[PDB]
């Protein structure tokens, strides 16, 4: 699940299909969400919608304040 491949569409039934090599494949019982934007297809496990996520969060209390991030985390290492 940290891999790259190249492939070619083929026909399966009355539908296009795309082969998933073993290193990239999802479990056979995993429901997937497939979303296309332009020519880019994004595929990931279906675990709830964004509207549901936001509704769930809004039904919950929230912390008293929003954390002030620290982005500057990488130390200065001697010698690279």
């Amino acid at each position: 699940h940290h891999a790259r491949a190249t492939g070619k569409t083929f026909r399966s039934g009355n539908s296009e299909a795309v082969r998933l090599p073993r290193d990239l494949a999802f479990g056979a019982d995993v429901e997937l969400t497939l979303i296309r934007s332009g020519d880019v297809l994004t595929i990931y496990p279906s675990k709830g919608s964004i509207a549901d996520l936001v509704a769930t969060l809004n039904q919950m209390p929230r912390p008293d304040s929003v954390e002030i991030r620290d982005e500057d985390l990488f130390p200065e290492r001697p010698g690279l």
Binding site: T33, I35, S37, T42, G48, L53, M60, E67, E71
Partner: protein
């Protein structure tokens, strides 16, 4: 698809209503970097009095949102970024997350767009 910058994800975790509404308007997959996950996990435990709510809300986010691991393809993009823009110790995390967006052909959504202006090829939305 969209990759949320860490700050955006923090505002989601901590209940900022302006961000929570923005997120439902995005028309595409919403992706979280594992690097943002690390930052979010640490933030849960920064203030004991907020940790219970931050934990529970982050847990719902991590259940739903798909997470992008940081892999060789992302590190190759990072190399191309520094080859072009030079080295910035201050912006390493920024550029790691942007590198993942580049590798996955995703638009990067951020409150700090000016820190990403030096990354060729990156599609950016400023919030």
């Amino acid at each position: 698809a969209y990759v949320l910058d860490t700050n955006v994800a923090i505002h989601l975790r901590d209940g900022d209503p302006e961000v929570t509404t923005r997120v439902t308007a995005l028309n595409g997959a919403i992706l979280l970097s594992i690097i943002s996950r690390v930052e979010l996990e640490g933030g849960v435990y920064r203030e004991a009095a907020q940790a219970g709510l931050r934990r529970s809300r982050l847990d719902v986010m991590l259940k739903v949102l798909p997470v992008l691991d940081f892999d060789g393809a992302a590190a190759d993009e990072y190399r191309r970024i520094v080859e072009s823009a030079g080295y910035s110790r201050r912006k390493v995390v920024d550029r790691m997350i942007a590198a993942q967006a580049l590798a996955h052909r995703a638009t990067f959504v951020t409150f700090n767009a000016d820190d990403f202006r030096d990354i060729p090829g990156l599609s950016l939305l400023a919030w």
